[PDB]
Write a protein that binds this ligand. Structure first.
Ligand SMILES: O=C(N[C@H](CO)[C@H](O)c1ccc([N+](=O)[O-])cc1)C(Cl)Cl
Ligand SMILES: [K+]
Ligand SMILES: [K+]
Ligand SMILES: [K+]
Ligand SMILES: [K+]
Ligand SMILES: [K+]
Ligand SMILES: [K+]
Ligand SMILES: [K+]
Ligand SMILES: [Mg+2]
Ligand SMILES: [Mg+2]
Ligand SMILES: [Mg+2]
Ligand SMILES: [Mg+2]
Ligand SMILES: [Mg+2]
Ligand SMILES: [Mg+2]
Ligand SMILES: [Mg+2]
Ligand SMILES: [Mg+2]
Ligand SMILES: [Mg+2]
Ligand SMILES: [Mg+2]
Ligand SMILES: [Mg+2]
Ligand SMILES: [Mg+2]
Ligand SMILES: [Mg+2]
Ligand SMILES: [Mg+2]
Ligand SMILES: [Mg+2]
Ligand SMILES: [Mg+2]
Ligand SMILES: [Zn+2]
Lengths: 175, 37, 143, 207
RNA sequence: AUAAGUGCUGAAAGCAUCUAAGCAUGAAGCCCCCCUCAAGAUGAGAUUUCCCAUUCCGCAAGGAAGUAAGAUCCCUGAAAG
RNA sequence: GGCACCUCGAUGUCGGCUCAUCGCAUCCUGGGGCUGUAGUCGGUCCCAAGGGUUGGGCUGUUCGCCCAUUAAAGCGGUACGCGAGCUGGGUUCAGAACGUCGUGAGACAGUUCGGUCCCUAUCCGUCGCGGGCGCAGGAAAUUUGAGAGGAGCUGUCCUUAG
RNA sequence: AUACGUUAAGUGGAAAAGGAUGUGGAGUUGCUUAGACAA
């Protein structure tokens, strides 16, 4: 596992605490993330460098080693820099608006679609055609962004819908 | 989705994968999406 | 000359078995034998020589493989199209006592005496049982 | 949940304000009494036991008299439980009157349906007759008992037997009027049972 | 709670990948919700209330006899048959 | 169709009627992928058996064609389900006739008109309804719900919006 | 039961052409710290 073997530098502003049963808590300026890992993995912290060690070269271990390493890296990056996903509303009359904590989507349905973010996730609407999902947990930022995109996934005849920023929507010619 | 006994690359961009103990082809071309069945 | 146990001679102990982390079938086969009295040298086929068994932590019984999802408990109501089904996961969550009872019942003799032997089984979801009065000993499974 | 026990008096009709003619069932429900409060601690579930219709002392027994003693009421002919009610609202001995309901409120009405005695498959199960002519000797019989292969009749082959006398709930009936003076509910439409039979009127479960 | 399907994060396999660990979503279908029966559920459950510890043999075991609360026979009937 | 293994001291045979029940290779409705999917429609494949799945004309018919509907007018199994449940139009006794073949008696998966469908339910099974005992005293009520059954279909219009 | 392996499919405990980075054991061979392969 090239990925697993890679060493993780912890920024000065992030504290990683290893608790019982391979539960790692990572604290930084943007918040705290706690996660339990598989017992077999050996997570060491030495001189601000996090290292992950696999007990054997068994299929499961080689896979787990890379995953554990990647998740810990995402936790450290998440509490320091955070994760942000950007969505672009493409369509005539398609608009996003923030109502308190709720995202309100007007995407050509007979009713507005409201999305309530989970705890630890902020939704920003910098423009009526742009939505930014921000948070510490990469998985959660991704899940919510997918939830938003699902309201009206991009269609191919005119690319209308909610897309990821920079998403190459496959296009078919109509008439 | 093509559900067929013979799942194979149709083009060069097709990629054979395994999900839930089922052989599949994923591709950027959606016509080439295949699942063994 | 071969001695035969009878209702006068037989003396039944109470045993507690903890089901926590035990494989359903492996626990069941040992309990079934205890209920039958196969562990007693006075074992007699035509009478119930076995011991009473309390099972606690029945919800914490384990199944190997994908049996939680894929092991199906069928029953038929005797009405047309009356086959009902529950998964092992559904059984363990909602009907853990029935799950153990079903496992053990299938391993006991069939007939009047086998049905009588099953009456000495008592299965419980959690850690506690109400048979303090019967003064039950802990029984570790041999395995 | 709200509820009350009454007797079915009969049917009549009422002109609404807009001039529509509504068929109504009249239910006379003299004040019900809470005889007992069942609790999750004692009984394993929450319910109130309503007593209705004062019985003569001769027709009562010592078990009955002792049971109604806490409520401080005469022995009751009809006793039924309501579940899903607010336990703190009720107390033993409290009267439950028809004015718990109001006009416009949607109710479910439970009663025992009228007895029809032993009835054939045509009446009981709504089955079709065979032909009345064209050589037919098959009029009101219940049809084939089933296929050959099982060597037996399946359960649920519907046959003649005792019809009616079954508990029936009719859902989503409207209260037209509540006569608190005469202890009457006027309910729109028809409800199960003979005149004088016990009717339970409850707030609608689907509302 | 799921099916097909759609995913998120994610390595095995520096990438990619809905899957291996982990986390979602998703059918008139499944389990409930709604209606009815139901403790012979011999695993015979629960709650409230009532009666109250009688007289005889028989060494006791047990049996017999009057009864209590309560119910029935019989009778008037129908909303039941 | 092949075979000739059960039944010739009899296992009634087509179609309809009555009553269904099961499979899913799904006709409709529900959820989807791909589309040579602009939309409205469709095509194709995947999941799905919960419920639903028409009245007529002709013919003994099944089938089929046709008329008019329908969301749809599914395909199969159950002794080509069901005659001790019904029918008996057809097939398949005795009468008669036509064509045809035969010297003839007669014969014909050729046709035609007419032609007896028995049974008081013992057992299991099915649907109802009682009696008994049980349930560690005897009673009167109210009940929990293991478990079981039922229900489960769908159109059109208006609005969103020309 | 013992010992050493294999299988993750309840395969075991029905079914073929064909399809497939399933996984175990052998062997051949190209390229590679004169820096491969991935990015
Ligand atoms: O011959 C009869 N039936 C026999 C059994 O004895 C059998 O069931 C059968 C029925 C029909 C058939 N046919 O149509 O060719 C042949 C035999 C009597 Cl029911 Cl008449
Ligand atoms: K009982
Ligand atoms: K024969
Ligand atoms: K169906
Ligand atoms: K007949
Ligand atoms: K017969
Ligand atoms: K029999
Ligand atoms: K198997
Ligand atoms: Mg091919
Ligand atoms: Mg008719
Ligand atoms: Mg007649
Ligand atoms: Mg049989
Ligand atoms: Mg009881
Ligand atoms: Mg054949
Ligand atoms: Mg031969
Ligand atoms: Mg014979
Ligand atoms: Mg299918
Ligand atoms: Mg037939
Ligand atoms: Mg028959
Ligand atoms: Mg001639
Ligand atoms: Mg002939
Ligand atoms: Mg139940
Ligand atoms: Mg039963
Ligand atoms: Mg098998
Ligand atoms: Zn391709």
């Amino acid at each position: 596992s090239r990925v697993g073997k890679k060493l993780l530098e912890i920024p000065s502003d992030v504290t990683v605490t290893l608790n019982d049963n391979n539960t790692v808590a990572v604290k930084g300026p943007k918040g705290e993330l706690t996660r339990t890992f598989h017992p077999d993995m050996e997570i060491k912290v030495e001189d601000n460098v996090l290292t992950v060690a696999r007990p054997s070269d068994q299929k499961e271990h080689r896979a787990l080693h890379g995953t554990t390493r990647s998740l810990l890296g995402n936790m450290v990056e998440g509490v320091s820099k955070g994760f942000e996903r950007g969505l672009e509303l493409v369509g005539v009359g398609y608009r996003a608006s923030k109502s308190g904590n709720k995202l309100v989507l007007n995407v050509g349905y007979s009713h507005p679609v409201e999305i309530v973010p989970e705890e630890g996730i902020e939704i920003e609407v910098p423009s009526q055609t742009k939505v930014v999902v921000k948070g510490t947990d990469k998985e959660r930022v991704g899940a919510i962004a997918a939830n938003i995109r699902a309201v009206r996934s991009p269609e191919p005849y005119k690319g209308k819908g909610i897309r990821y920023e920079g998403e190459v929507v496959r296009r078919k010619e109509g008439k | 989705m093509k559900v067929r006994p013979s799942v194979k690359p149709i083009c060069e961009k097709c990629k054979v994968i395994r999900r839930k103990g089922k052989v599949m082809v994923i591709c950027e071309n959606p016509k080439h999406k295949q699942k063994q069945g | 000359t071969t001695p035969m146990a009878n209702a006068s001679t037989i003396e039944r102990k109470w045993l507690v078995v903890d089901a926590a982390g035990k494989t359903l079938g492996r626990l069941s086969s040992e309990v079934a034998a205890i209920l039958r009295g196969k562990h007693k040298p006075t074992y007699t086929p035509h009478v119930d020589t076995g011991d009473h068994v309390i099972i606690i932590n029945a919800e914490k019984i384990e199944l190997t493989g994908k049996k939680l999802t894929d092991k199906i408990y069928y029953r038929h109501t005797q009405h047309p199209g009356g086959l009902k089904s529950r998964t092992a996961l559904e059984m363990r969550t909602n009907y853990p006592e029935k799950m153990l009872e079903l496992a053990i019942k299938g391993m006991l003799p069939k007939g009047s005496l086998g049905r009588q032997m099953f009456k000495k089984l008592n299965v419980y979801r959690g850690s506690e049982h109400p048979h303090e009065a019967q003064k039950p000993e802990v029984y570790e499974l041999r395995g | 949940t709200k509820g009350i026990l009454g007797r079915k008096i009969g049917m009549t009709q009422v002109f609404a304000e807009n001039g529509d003619l509504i068929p109504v069932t009249v239910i006379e429900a003299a004040p019900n009494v809470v005889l007992q409060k069942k609790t999750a601690e004692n009984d394993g579930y929450e319910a109130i036991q309503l007593g209705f219709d004062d019985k003569r002392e001769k027709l009562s027994n010592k078990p009955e008299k002792g049971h109604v003693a806490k409520a401080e009421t005469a022995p009751k002919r009809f006793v039924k439980e309501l579940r899903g009610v607010e336990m703190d609202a009720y107390e033993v001995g409290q009267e439950v009157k028809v004015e718990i309901f109001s006009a416009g409120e949607i109710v479910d009405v439970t009663g025992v349906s009228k007895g029809k005695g032993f009835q054939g498959a045509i009446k009981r199960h709504g089955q079709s007759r065979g032909p009345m002519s064209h050589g037919s000797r098959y009029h009101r019989r219940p049809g084939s008992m089933g296929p050959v292969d099982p060597n037996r009749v399946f359960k649920g082959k519907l046959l003649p037997g005792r019809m009616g006398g079954e508990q029936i709930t009719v859902q989503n009936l409207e209260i037209v009027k509540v006569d608190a003076e005469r202890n009457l509910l006027l309910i729109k439409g028809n409800v199960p049972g003979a005149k004088k039979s016990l009717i339970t009127v409850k707030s609608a479960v689907k509302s």
